Design a protein around this ligand. Structure first.
Ligand code: 7FW
Ligand code: TF3
Ligand code: CL
Ligand code: CL
Ligand code: CL
Length: 344
């Protein structure tokens, strides 16, 4: 077949990062034809760029069942999208069977994450868990997952618009605190269920420019929830477990600061912290892979990719003996929120 040729062709192109503006302008609808003509080019670009990177992996990794699996998915998905390169954007069936095609692709790729996890696992027992294996896994998975996040963003934007207020997965009016409370309510629910004690939540807002206004932004709230949800899980585990032979359960304090470009979200706990040495391993896919509420692999690094994805970040610093702070940094301004795609 043609796969390695297509890979070859489209991996000469560079994925085109979009900004929230451009994202918003894509269904504000009837320029679905325009989403179609765009996506039939750009998915193959993006699919191919990562596919080529998968190929640069040494044979001992690439030859493993897990990788060969997801690689087979990427090939089929690229083929699936190929069928439409000739097709004409004015035939309303051309269009609606592209949607199906995108939907089907998105389901095909669902289990990528625990699949790669299995490859890491096999690799760990099969070749060792040395620092250098670890930089390498990290390097590849941070890019891959990031790649994949951006592919999904594209598919979801398309399928959700072409079945106001919300534009696909973008809320142009996301109330950050609203999303915080939700993630907290849900983490508490699970925290209550497994621990039978859950810390309270305290939120403070700091709108620097407008003392009064509630903090709203343009974002992808499911993205934000995911990140918050994961940080809640962790801060809850730590809070509860560090205090089981003690009466008070200190609340989890979250602050939302809106600056001139940063919108920053800090989740501070009193869980007794982590010493500085063990902080880098928390983001390591490898060290957080192994054969409840947490101990539950990948949430941190993936949450951090989520933040990186529109030029944000996610950092942890801890005080051993006291607790951990966790900061999600996001762009305040739609203008500054541009996709961040792995290089190639
Ligand atoms: C428990 N998980 C999930 C996880 C997932 C895969 C793993 N894989 C291997 C080992 N541990 C894993 C843990 C955590 O990441 C996690 C790690 C460290 C903390 N701890 C330390 C701690 C304190 C008391 C009791 C237990 C732990 C933290 O300080 C901490 C870390 C991140 C965070 O957002 C908040 C925190 O409070 C809290 C949570
Ligand atoms: C399953 C997926 C996540 C996975 C699992 C495991 C890995 C591991 O990847 C490694 C490990 C060691 C080396 C050293 C090497 O060969 N150096 C060459 C010397 N110049 C290179 C790579 Cl790409 C990647 C991806
Ligand atoms: Cl990255
Ligand atoms: Cl789109
Ligand atoms: Cl850090």
């Amino acid at each position: 077949g043609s796969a390695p040729k297509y890979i070859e062709h489209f991996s000469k192109f560079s994925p085109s990062p979009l900004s929230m503006k451009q994202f918003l302008d894509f269904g504000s609808n009837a320029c679905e034809k325009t989403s179609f003509t765009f996506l039939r080019q750009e998915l193959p670009v993006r699919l191919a760029n990562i596919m080529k990177e998968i190929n640069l992996l040494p044979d001992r990794v690439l030859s493993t069942p897990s990788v060969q699996l997801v690689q087979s998915w990427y090939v089929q998905s690229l083929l699936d999208i190929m069928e439409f390169l000739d097709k004409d954007p004015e035939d309303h069936r051309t269009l609606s069977q592209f949607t199906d095609a995108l939907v089907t692709i998105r389901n095909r790729h669902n289990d990528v994450v625990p699949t790669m996890a299995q490859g890491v696992l096999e690799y760990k027992d099969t070749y060792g868990d040395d620092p250098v294996s670890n930089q390498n896994i990290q390097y590849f998975l941070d890019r891959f997952y990031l790649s994949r996040i951006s592919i999904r963003m594209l598919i979801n934007q398309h399928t959700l618009i072409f079945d106001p207020k919300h534009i696909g997965s973008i809320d142009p009016n996301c109330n950050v605190s609203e999303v915080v409370k939700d993630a907290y309510d849900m983490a508490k629910l699970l925290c209550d269920k497994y621990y039978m004690a859950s810390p309270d939540l305290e939120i403070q807002e700091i709108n620097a420019a407008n003392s009064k206004q509630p903090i709203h932004m343009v974002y992808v709230p499911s993205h934000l929830y995911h990140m918050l949800f994961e940080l809640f899980k962790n801060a809850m585990r730590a809070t509860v477990e560090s205090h089981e032979s003690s009466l008070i359960l200190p609340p989890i304090k979250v602050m939302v600061a809106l600056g001139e470009e940063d919108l920053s979200i800090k989740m501070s706990d009193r869980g007794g912290g982590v010493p500085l040495r063990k902080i880098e391993r928390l983001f390591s896919y490898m060290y957080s892979t192994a054969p409840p509420l947490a101990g539950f692999g990948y949430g941190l690094p993936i949450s951090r990719l989520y933040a990186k994805y529109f030029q944000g970040d996610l950092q942890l610093f801890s005080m051993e003996g006291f607790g951990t702070d966790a900061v999600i940094y996001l762009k305040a301004l739609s203008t500054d929120s541009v996709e961040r795609l792995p290089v190639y």
